[PDB]
Design a binder for these strands. Structure first.
Ligand SMILES: [Mg+2]
Ligand SMILES: [Mg+2]
Ligand SMILES: [Mg+2]
Lengths: 289, 293
DNA sequence: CTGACGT
DNA sequence: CTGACGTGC
DNA sequence: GCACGTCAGA
DNA sequence: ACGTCAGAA
């Protein structure tokens, strides 16, 4: 009665639902705590274009606890989306909502454009083999051992709003073969350091057990999931193989054909500069013919 | 085709109510985020004894995210209650729940027993002048600026469970003169470092605006409080003055002689007191009543 | 008052 | 795909 | 400053 | 699990 006379303090951790993702926001760190999304074959197809979008504060966040572009611009860290724009080609609105800063963490440039991008590509690749893919992604600030042997959590904050820069990122992938398939569910949890990572490390190297990630993150993922349901490691029922340099450079150059002038030859000179082979790539003619 | 098919991830931040306090727990740091308490004159009066209490994990916290006594003992940090036992003399059940580790943060030993203890004493002193007092306490991990210009949050984690050691503690104090009076409410917010603090800093030196604390903590305190109305400065309408070295040392000395179960120990207590040249009437009497033994 | 350790 | 960065009204 | 054009990523 | 021991000069 009298204890709650003026209300309990507010943490602001309630789930916020958008068109194709949901998130819980961390008001102290100015970053999401988790972002849940659902991927299917039809959702990664469409005409939504990120070039019509722009990062902006989430109007649903109280501005005292929101990040702003001034925090990121000039900080040496990129704006890293947790729910990617590439998963929302089907809806201009869903894609534009992924550019709210409530979906964004400070991320290393090479990591966001490289390794983490390839992990996002693999999740979309999974929709060719599973009807439905659920993904939870978010930031982590993990401890390290200090010179005297004590354990310490240390992370940079940037801007006037002290946006927290995570030391690692996590992704939980849950895939279901079909709505009526009796097959087991595929589940994987991964933790990737927020730094440049090349093509030598395989995705299985960053895998962790779901119980481990839950203890590190203070969250419990997919709490409605039946624990006696057959759930297999996604690295056992699938490959968890990311694209190599040739596949990645080839896929990116195919994407780049949607460009406006005849700078395609410069784009074509880059392909033989890295000595990638002559893939079909018939989009060259489907672009001009 | 349902995003919430298997449920949203749970963060575990729902408010937990106990006999005389409530808290929100941080499952990642193994500490409370805030602890809300209410005190009055009658609440700080009673026979409840903390000697009959033990620190123990809160049995309502999932053991995966619970602190344990093994994280604290030998770490160099003490178990610091955010809702103090001293606010719960009226109820042995209320006091026992403040020894749940859901109410505990790793706190500097000297700060625990000294400056923070004196702030808790001032909160109970406020019940002599206000009928109802609300207090929100909690930990903070604040950033610091290195020589190279960039800003870093750094904090220790202790034990196998990595209990986060705060750099700072906060306390928000809301006091109402009476439930029928029209006098505006008094509010103070304070942030003290989790370190030894002597007797020189006055409490007002750690005072911050409520808005600055909310920005630092990511919390909104007292959301049903009418910030629009006149709200007075608690360090203006009241003292915000802690006990000094003489009053504090005297207070502890009188409570120490009641626990003199060895005559040589009562004699030692006497010697330690005479550094500060103190002699009071009640201790004068209480000394002889337990000296004859 | 707030905490601890030794049999 | 993922982003930043250099200009220009 | 904030919206486009150009460039880059093992 | 329970009696001691300590806390700005
Ligand atoms: Mg990215
Ligand atoms: Mg204490
Ligand atoms: Mg005032």
């Amino acid at each position: 009665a009298v204890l709650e006379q003026f209300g309990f303090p507010l943490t602001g951790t309630e789930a916020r639902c958008y068109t194709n993702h949901a998130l819980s926001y961390d008001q102290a760190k100015r970053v999401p705590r988790w972002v849940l999304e659902h991927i299917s074959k039809s959702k990664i197809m469409g005409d939504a274009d990120r070039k019509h979008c722009k990062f902006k504060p989430d109007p649903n966040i109280p501005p005292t606890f929101s990040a702003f572009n001034e925090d990121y611009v000039g900080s040496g860290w990129s704006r890293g989306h947790m729910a990617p724009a590439g998963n929302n080609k089907f809806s201009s609105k869903a894609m534009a909502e992924t550019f709210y800063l409530s979906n964004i963490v400070p991320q290393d440039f090479d990591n966001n454009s490289g390794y983490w991008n390839r992990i996002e590509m693999y999740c979309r690749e999974l929709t060719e083999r599973f009807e439905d893919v659920w993904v939870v992604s978010g930031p982590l600030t993990l401890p390290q051992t200090r010179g005297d042997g004590k354990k310490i959590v240390s992370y940079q904050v940037i801007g006037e709003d002290n946006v927290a820069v995570p030391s690692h990122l996590y992704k939980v992938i849950l895939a279901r073969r079909s709505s009526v398939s009796t097959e087991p569910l595929a589940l994987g949890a991964f933790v990737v350091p927020n730094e440049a990572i090349g093509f030598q490390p395989q995705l299985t190297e960053f895998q962790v057990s779901l119980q481990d990630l839950e203890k590190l993150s203070g969250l419990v993922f997919f709490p409605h999931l039946d624990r006696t349901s057959d759930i297999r490691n996604i690295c056992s029922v699938d490959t968890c193989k990311l694209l190599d340099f040739q596949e990645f450079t080839l896929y990116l150059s195919t994407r780049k054909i949607e460009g406006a002038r005849s700078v395609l030859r410069l784009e074509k000179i880059m392909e033989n500069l890295k000595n990638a082979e002559i893939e079909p790539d018939d989009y060259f003619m489907s672009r001009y013919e």
